Design a binder for this molecule. Sequence first.
Ligand SMILES: CCCCCCCCCCCCCC(=O)OC[C@H](COP(=O)(O)OCC(O)COP(=O)(O)OC[C@@H](COC(=O)CCCCCCCCCCCCC)OC(=O)CCCCCCCCCCCCC)OC(=O)CCCCCCCCCCCCC
Ligand code: BCL
Ligand code: BCL
Ligand code: BCL
Ligand SMILES: COC(C)(C)C/C=C/C(C)=C/C=C/C(C=O)=C/C=C/C(C)=C/C=C/C=C(C)/C=C/C=C(\C)CC/C=C(C)/C=C/C=C(\C)C(=O)O
Ligand SMILES: COC(C)(C)C/C=C/C(C)=C/C=C/C(C=O)=C/C=C/C(C)=C/C=C/C=C(C)/C=C/C=C(\C)CC/C=C(C)/C=C/C=C(\C)C(=O)O
Ligand SMILES: COC(C)(C)C/C=C/C(C)=C/C=C/C(C=O)=C/C=C/C(C)=C/C=C/C=C(C)/C=C/C=C(\C)CC/C=C(C)/C=C/C=C(\C)C(=O)O
Ligand SMILES: COC(C)(C)C/C=C/C(C)=C/C=C/C(C=O)=C/C=C/C(C)=C/C=C/C=C(C)/C=C/C=C(\C)CC/C=C(C)/C=C/C=C(\C)C(=O)O
Ligand SMILES: COC(C)(C)C/C=C/C(C)=C/C=C/C(C=O)=C/C=C/C(C)=C/C=C/C=C(C)/C=C/C=C(\C)CC/C=C(C)/C=C/C=C(\C)C(=O)O
Ligand SMILES: COC(C)(C)C/C=C/C(C)=C/C=C/C(C=O)=C/C=C/C(C)=C/C=C/C=C(C)/C=C/C=C(\C)CC/C=C(C)/C=C/C=C(\C)C(=O)O
Ligand SMILES: COC(C)(C)C/C=C/C(C)=C/C=C/C(C=O)=C/C=C/C(C)=C/C=C/C=C(C)/C=C/C=C(\C)CC/C=C(C)/C=C/C=C(\C)C(=O)O
Ligand SMILES: CCCCCCCCCCCCO[C@@H]1O[C@H](CO)[C@@H](O[C@H]2O[C@H](CO)[C@@H](O)[C@H](O)[C@H]2O)[C@H](O)[C@H]1O
Lengths: 56, 59, 54, 56, 56, 179, 60, 38, 37, 38, 38, 39, 40, 39, 39, 51, 271, 48, 49, 48, 48, 48
Amino acid sequence: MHRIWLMFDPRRVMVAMVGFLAVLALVIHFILLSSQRYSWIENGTLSAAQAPVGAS
Amino acid sequence: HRIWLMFDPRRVMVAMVGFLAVLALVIHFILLSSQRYSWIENGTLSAAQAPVGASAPAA
Amino acid sequence: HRIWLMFDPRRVMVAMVGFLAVLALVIHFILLSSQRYSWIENGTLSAAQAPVGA
Amino acid sequence: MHRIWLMFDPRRVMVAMVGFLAVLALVIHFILLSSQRYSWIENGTLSAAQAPVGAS
Amino acid sequence: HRIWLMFDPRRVMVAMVGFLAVLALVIHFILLSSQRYSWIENGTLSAAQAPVGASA
Amino acid sequence: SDIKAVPADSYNGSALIPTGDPMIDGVGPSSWANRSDTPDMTFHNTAKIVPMRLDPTYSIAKGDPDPRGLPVVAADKQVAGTVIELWVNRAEPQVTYYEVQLTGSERRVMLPAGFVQWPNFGLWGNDKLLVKAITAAQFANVPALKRDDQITLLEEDMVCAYYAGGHLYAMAERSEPII
Amino acid sequence: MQYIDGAQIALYAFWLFFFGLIIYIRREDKREGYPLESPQGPREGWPAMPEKKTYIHRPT
Amino acid sequence: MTEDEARRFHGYFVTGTLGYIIVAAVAHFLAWQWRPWF
Amino acid sequence: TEDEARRFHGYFVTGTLGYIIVAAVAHFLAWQWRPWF
Amino acid sequence: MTEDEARRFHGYFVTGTLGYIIVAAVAHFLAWQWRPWF
Amino acid sequence: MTEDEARRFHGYFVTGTLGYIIVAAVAHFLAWQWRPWF
Amino acid sequence: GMTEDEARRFHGYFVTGTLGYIIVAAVAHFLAWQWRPWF
Amino acid sequence: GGMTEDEARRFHGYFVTGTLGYIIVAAVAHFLAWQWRPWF
Amino acid sequence: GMTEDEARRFHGYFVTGTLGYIIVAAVAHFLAWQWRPWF
Amino acid sequence: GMTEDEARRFHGYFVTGTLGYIIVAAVAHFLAWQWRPWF
Amino acid sequence: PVDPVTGQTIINGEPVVGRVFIMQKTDGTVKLGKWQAQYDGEPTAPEAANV
Amino acid sequence: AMLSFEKKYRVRGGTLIGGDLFDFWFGPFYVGFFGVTTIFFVTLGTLLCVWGAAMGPTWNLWQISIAPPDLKYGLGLAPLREGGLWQIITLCALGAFGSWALRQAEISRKLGMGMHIPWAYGGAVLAYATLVVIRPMLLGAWGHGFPYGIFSHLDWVSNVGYQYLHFHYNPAHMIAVTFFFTNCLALAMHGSLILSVTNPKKGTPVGTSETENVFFRDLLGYSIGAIGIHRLGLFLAVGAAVWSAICIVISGPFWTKGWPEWWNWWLNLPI
Amino acid sequence: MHRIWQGMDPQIIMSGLGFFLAGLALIIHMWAYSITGWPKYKKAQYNA
Amino acid sequence: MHRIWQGMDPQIIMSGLGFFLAGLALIIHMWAYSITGWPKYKKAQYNAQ
Amino acid sequence: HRIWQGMDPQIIMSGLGFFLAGLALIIHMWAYSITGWPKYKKAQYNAQ
Amino acid sequence: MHRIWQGMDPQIIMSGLGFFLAGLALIIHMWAYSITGWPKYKKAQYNA
Amino acid sequence: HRIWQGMDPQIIMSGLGFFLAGLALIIHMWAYSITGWPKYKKAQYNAQ
Ligand SMILES: CCCCCCCCCCCCCC(=O)OC[C@H](COP(=O)(O)OCC(O)COP(=O)(O)OC[C@@H](COC(=O)CCCCCCCCCCCCC)OC(=O)CCCCCCCCCCCCC)OC(=O)CCCCCCCCCCCCC
Ligand code: BCL
Ligand code: BCL
Ligand code: BCL
Ligand SMILES: COC(C)(C)C/C=C/C(C)=C/C=C/C(C=O)=C/C=C/C(C)=C/C=C/C=C(C)/C=C/C=C(\C)CC/C=C(C)/C=C/C=C(\C)C(=O)O
Ligand SMILES: COC(C)(C)C/C=C/C(C)=C/C=C/C(C=O)=C/C=C/C(C)=C/C=C/C=C(C)/C=C/C=C(\C)CC/C=C(C)/C=C/C=C(\C)C(=O)O
Ligand SMILES: COC(C)(C)C/C=C/C(C)=C/C=C/C(C=O)=C/C=C/C(C)=C/C=C/C=C(C)/C=C/C=C(\C)CC/C=C(C)/C=C/C=C(\C)C(=O)O
Ligand SMILES: COC(C)(C)C/C=C/C(C)=C/C=C/C(C=O)=C/C=C/C(C)=C/C=C/C=C(C)/C=C/C=C(\C)CC/C=C(C)/C=C/C=C(\C)C(=O)O
Ligand SMILES: COC(C)(C)C/C=C/C(C)=C/C=C/C(C=O)=C/C=C/C(C)=C/C=C/C=C(C)/C=C/C=C(\C)CC/C=C(C)/C=C/C=C(\C)C(=O)O
Ligand SMILES: COC(C)(C)C/C=C/C(C)=C/C=C/C(C=O)=C/C=C/C(C)=C/C=C/C=C(C)/C=C/C=C(\C)CC/C=C(C)/C=C/C=C(\C)C(=O)O
Ligand SMILES: COC(C)(C)C/C=C/C(C)=C/C=C/C(C=O)=C/C=C/C(C)=C/C=C/C=C(C)/C=C/C=C(\C)CC/C=C(C)/C=C/C=C(\C)C(=O)O
Ligand SMILES: CCCCCCCCCCCCO[C@@H]1O[C@H](CO)[C@@H](O[C@H]2O[C@H](CO)[C@@H](O)[C@H](O)[C@H]2O)[C@H](O)[C@H]1O
């Protein structure tokens, strides 16, 4: 359990984890912004019934 | 509160301020690009006149 | 305050002057090329005649 | 407020200040020369009534 | 003045002359490229006949 | 603690501050590598870098100033000595070192040609040598050689490292921010 | 077939060759100054440091 | 450095962080009244 | 050097706060001329 | 770099800055009569 | 630089600078008579 | 930090300040309710 | 530091006096404003 | 800079110059009011 | 900077300057109110 | 469709508070498809050379 | 992690801005004041590039394009939809390229080295600054810059090259191409030369400096020096970028017609 | 109950309570303006 | 009560109190101008003569 | 009066003068548009 | 009274006072020309 | 009660404040939508 920190130092793992989480969060937020259904800056105030849906 | 033993407070402050400045500028710039929140041009409009984005109707 | 015992007062004020100058230029340049706040051309219009994005 | 010069070198301050002011003055003069209303080399002699005004 | 104890008179004099010569050449060439003050071609015109920017 | 330098603070990645005089103890830009303690050899098993007095077939090309007997102006604008002999590379014919006799003589030091600049970039009157890396006083602490006719790679590194380290340690101003 | 064509196949063969070449050159880059020193101990990136390479000098 | 100065610093850092969050909350509430995004 | 930091802090605080007040007045003047909301 | 020369320099610098601002103020007022921008 | 020739240089610099501005003012006066720009 | 003696003295002022602020705020809500009740 | 117990004791006196004088003067200004244009 | 002794005489001349300047300005506005009142 | 003796005398000079500035400004608004009242 | 009285846009039977515009990408650009699709709206293949 | 000889070189001093605050190493990287400035501009510019991709029609890496504004905006800051985002990214790139050069100067100062690397890098920065700053200013609009897209900026090069009907006839372009081709040939010769001596015919000793000079005199009758080849490589590579900057800055600001017609001067010599 | 204030700067506590109270009073005042509609109805009586 | 001022510079307090008072009085004067509509209605009378 | 201790009188007067100069100039512009004084008097003399 | 001048160069005071008075007098003169319309009404008479 | 030992009392309270403040804000949003309270009272006052 805790012995993973005797193998990976806490400082390096924390910096990599923070960096990966920030990049992932920005990528997902930007992917949603580019979509029609989840461009919340633009549609945003539309109800779930009014929101765009992809073609069947 | 022990985080300042493992990290230099001087360097964390500079990193934090730089990150907040980049994030704030990016969000302001994204909103300036948007049609609904291009406040420099359309900031005087009311919420009833503000642009709302929609998809094309079926027909 | 003891903040100046950690950061050099001479260097902080130099970096702060540079950041504010660049920020002031960017805001002035953003407004200058906008339709509503191109004050060099339309600064004499009243608030009712100023353009509004629509 | 003379104590400011005990921190900053008067030589470097004046040279930096003179350089910034000249660059700023050239930029503002060039912005006005590129505008319709204040292109004073060309229009110049028009009264304030006949000077161009941006569209309303 | 005490400013010459701070700045070398030779460095200032050379830089000032170089600045003034560049500034003078820029202004003369800006007027030459203009329509109203292209004096080599239209210099013999009277002030009433000289070109004026549009009132628009 | 065999490198004579101490970390600034306890945060990792921090820079070291030398304890003594970094020019002599070989720290930072004054560091040298532990090369072989044997002279470099040419293609025919002879010393690669030798003084001209050991080989009279070498001379100075016409139109090139003879730097022997010329003053050596250091970073203080004060003469630190006079050039008296040139050390040349025999593998590829080129001046490698200058031998400088100090003002009060009593000793001779080496000066790599890479730190030698000539007045007006060698275009107008060439009446002195410019050494911007070291001061006239530190010319006396340049490491010496074991022999007066050959130089090993170990000492070759030491002389070059000593001069190159003086762009940061000649005066306190050279190791400080400009603003 | 239809979507797959010769230019694409050649491009991917070149990509594989380039990646192998980069691995080889990165192995050669680690022949001096390795292994790295860290508080946690010795460190080597990928690719791992190669075997010690010895030169040959002319006799005296 | 010392834990005495590690306690002084953390107090201002948390209060500065708290102050920054609160002004951002006020700013977001102002923008919501003017033009809500949901 | 702890005393000189306290004296500098008074100048920096006053200058920073006075600068923001001046910018607030300029923002007030711009609102009179042409409001952005 | 002494309190004596810092006071002597500050007097001339303030006056030179003070003089520079007023000439710009006169220039702006002269331009406002010719062609106002508001 | 003995600080005394700086006073000697200052008198020559000031007169040369002010004399150049006066001559340039006459040149702008002549150009105004030929073709005013306002 | 803060000692034992001044931790209690500060707490006494804080309780008095917190209480007086709430009562004063209670009067404001009372006056506002007779002007525009919000329920 | 600065403003020790004795200094802070006297400073708090002048601060409370100034705060009250500000309140009284502002109260009159609100009373005068109310007679001119009430806001409720 | 100036010492306390000379600043007393400098202030004396400076005050006299201010009053004389204001007196001349007062007559100037007085003569300008009859020619063209600005209210 | 200054001392207690220097600040005691300064405060007297500053108050009589702050005061006297207020009355002359008070006359300025009184004359302006008679000319063009702004309410 | 538009509400006859209020003028509000109706999307799937629900009115919208605001001026509705149809979302599009940068200058109405549309991602390309197959290479054959490049020849819709173009002239047909040219005739054989005159030899 | 550090190289086995690295510890004794990691000392303070050599910075242009700042002191012990920005004199540390993050992993292998050295972080100065200009390291902090580089990260700010890189992060801001890259995030705005990602935003420009999200505004566009596709996430395909080859098809993402952030375009400059229209020519009608003429040296102003256009709307961010209409090309203003390109201008903001350009400022971030300029700040990051400048900070990278100044950070390199700090590192060489700490190591007791010359200043050649920052100035060699400045040749590339000058070419970029000519493309997006100098030439657009001379032509009077920021819209004369090239778009930011992997294959979009190739379309710009093609169309701009054909604005002069045959860009091969540009005299400065002809010189710049020769610099690029000669640099590649010289680099192959230099790389081969060092490797052939250090890795000779199997079973034979490592060669010397005489071997290089003898070999190139046997092949070509002339052998540039060991320092001569490094001087020549610096001259060829940097001069390629400098002549590239000249070749693009004369097209439009100075020459507006087709480039083949420029050779009238050679055909109308009096002889 | 007082033992929670141990080892804490009293000036830091008051500034952090001042931030909370100032920002919460601003949000609820904007909240209350929307609900009551107070300035709106009075502005219409004076700007008509 | 008076111990809250311990260890503090009286000029920092006065500088921050001026910042509070000046910024607050600017917000509420703008608040008050839009509610009463004072300068608008008075300047409308004087710019129609 | 103890508030003046340690404060340079010249800096205080240079900060009071800067305050009063900028406040008087702003209110004068404020008062000009409210009263409309220069406009009406200038139009009287420029109606020739 | 006079203690405000202690440590000040009398030349600096008079040079800075003249800068103020010259620029202020020029601005108010341009201000007064526009209000009274003086040069206009007399220049047009001599140019009729 | 041996769960508290070895734990910082401030961290316990600062972590309860984060939990309670964020949960009370989620449910106040939840409650406004369900009851429709500000909507119906705002509409009474803002339609007159
Ligand atoms: C092709 C094959 C090979 C391909 C690959 C080629 C690779 C080439 C490079 C080879 C080396 C790579 C490894 C490396 O750099 O390691 C560094 C570090 C170990 O560092 P260390 O040795 O422990 O550090 C030494 C020293 O710095 C100690 O200082 P201290 O411990 O006090 O650190 C203080 C630092 C860190 O604190 C921070 O807050 C920085 C966090 C940075 C990452 C997170 C970014 C997002 C949040 C931002 C902050 C938010 C607020 C806190 O504080 C500093 O200030 C340090 C300098 C930071 C930069 C300068 C300041 C910039 C300020 C303006 C900009 C702000 C951000 C926008 O180790 C690790 O991070 C372990 C993981 C390494 C592998 C990479 C993993 C990447 C995961 C995510 C991939 C995403 C792909 C798109
Ligand atoms: C449509 C847009 C508007 C407009 C809206 C605004 C607004 C709104 C503001 C400005 C501001 C500024 N504008 Mg603009 N501006 C317009 C057109 C212009 C034009 C022009 C060519 O037309 C120019 C030259 C300027 C120039 C300027 C600057 C003088 C000023 C400060 C910039 C800054 O922060 O620098 C920062 C860079 C530095 C290097 C700072 C240097 C240090 C300063 C000088 C120190 C100040 C100390 C302080 C005064 C001390 C106070 C003491 C206490 C009172 C006791 N504006 C148009 C008409 N402008 C800002 C400002 O601060 O106004 C006061 C501001 O908020
Ligand atoms: C449409 C534009 C106009 C025009 C408008 C102007 C205007 C307006 C001016 C010039 C000026 C100049 N013009 Mg032009 N000019 C035109 C066409 C030309 C042509 C040409 C081939 O057509 C030429 C060659 C020139 C050349 C020149 C230079 C002589 C000069 C700029 C450089 C300078 O500063 O020199 C320096 C030359 C000198 C003679 C400086 C002498 C200085 C000395 C120190 C004076 C000493 C005085 C005494 C000792 C001291 C008194 C002290 C106290 C006061 C008592 N003009 C056209 C027709 N030109 C500028 C100038 O300086 O004019 C005089 C200027 O302001
Ligand atoms: C129809 C098209 C035309 C034509 C039109 C043009 C036009 C138009 C131009 C050129 C230019 C060039 N052309 Mg062409 N060209 C044609 C045919 C050719 C042929 C050929 C075989 O036919 C050749 C060899 C060339 C050769 C060349 C070069 C001389 C030059 C490009 C190099 C350069 O500028 O580098 C300079 C280097 C740079 C600009 C790079 C700067 C990089 C910066 C400083 C750093 C970036 C860092 C990066 C962001 C980091 C990323 C992250 C990290 C990877 C982690 N052309 C045809 C005939 N050519 C270009 C030129 O001269 O540009 C100045 C140019 O604009
Ligand atoms: C569509 O839009 C996209 C963008 C795509 C969607 C967005 C997505 C993403 C990923 C958003 C990310 C959000 C985020 C990440 O976590 C947000 C995280 C924000 C955070 C943590 C903010 C914290 C700020 C803290 C501050 C300001 C602290 C200030 C402290 C001060 C002032 C005190 C300093 C002074 C001192 C100490 C003096 C004492 C010294 C002493 C005593 C001494 O010296 O002794
Ligand atoms: C659409 O537009 C986009 C852009 C997209 C939207 C985005 C907007 C964004 C993100 C804005 C961000 C704004 C921001 C925060 O980041 C803004 C932050 C601003 C700040 C903090 C300004 C602070 C200014 C402080 C000043 C001027 C202080 C001056 C001090 C002086 C004069 C005193 C010096 C005294 C001395 C020297 C005496 C020495 C004595 C000595 C030595 C002695 O006595 O010994
Ligand atoms: C659309 O338009 C855009 C542009 C986009 C809108 C944007 C606008 C923006 C952002 C504007 C910013 C403006 C700005 C602030 O940032 C502007 C700041 C201006 C400033 C500070 C001007 C100050 C000038 C002061 C000067 C010249 C002083 C000169 C002093 C002299 C000559 C005397 C010195 C000599 C001495 C002392 C010798 C004695 C030596 C002695 C005794 C000795 O040796 O001892
Ligand atoms: C849109 O919907 C929405 C609107 C969001 C719905 C909202 C929902 C929610 C969940 C709202 C929550 C509100 C809330 C949470 O409980 C609100 C909580 C309010 C609270 C707790 C207020 C407490 C205030 C305390 C005060 C004023 C104390 C002052 C103390 C003073 C003055 C004494 C200072 C001490 C001195 C002077 C002695 C120094 C001695 C020293 C130094 C010594 O002796 O050493
Ligand atoms: C849009 O509408 C929205 C905005 C939304 C609606 C909301 C509005 C809200 C919520 C408003 C909040 C208002 C508020 C907060 O509650 C307001 C609180 C105001 C307060 C407290 C004002 C206090 C002023 C204090 C003054 C003037 C004191 C002056 C004292 C002086 C001068 C003496 C100094 C000492 C001297 C000279 C000598 C001592 C030195 C000594 C002895 C030494 O040196 O020793
Ligand atoms: C809206 O803006 C617009 C439209 C513009 C409206 C405007 C609005 C406003 C607000 C205008 C403000 C006007 C104003 C208010 O401040 C104007 C202020 C005016 C003032 C104060 C003038 C003071 C003048 C002082 C003078 C002439 C003194 C001269 C002294 C002399 C000659 C003696 C010198 C000799 C000496 C000393 C001997 C040396 C001894 C020595 C050396 C020895 O003994 O050693
Ligand atoms: C339009 O819409 C918006 C803008 C929103 C509307 C709102 C506007 C608002 C809110 C305005 C606020 C106004 C205000 C209050 O806050 C204004 C407050 C003004 C004040 C306080 C003025 C004070 C003036 C003081 C003076 C003149 C003192 C002079 C003293 C002198 C001369 C003596 C000098 C010393 C001498 C001679 C001896 C020294 C001894 C020495 C040296 C020794 O002893 O050594
Ligand atoms: C984005 C600025 C980049 C700065 C980096 C380079 C530094 C050099 C600065 C050059 C500044 C040129 O200044 C630029 O002039 C153009 C001329 O059309 C102005 O352009 C804008 O206003 C003018 C009139 O004001 C309008 O006629 C025009 O249609 C509009 O685009 C810009 O608002 C201004 O920014």
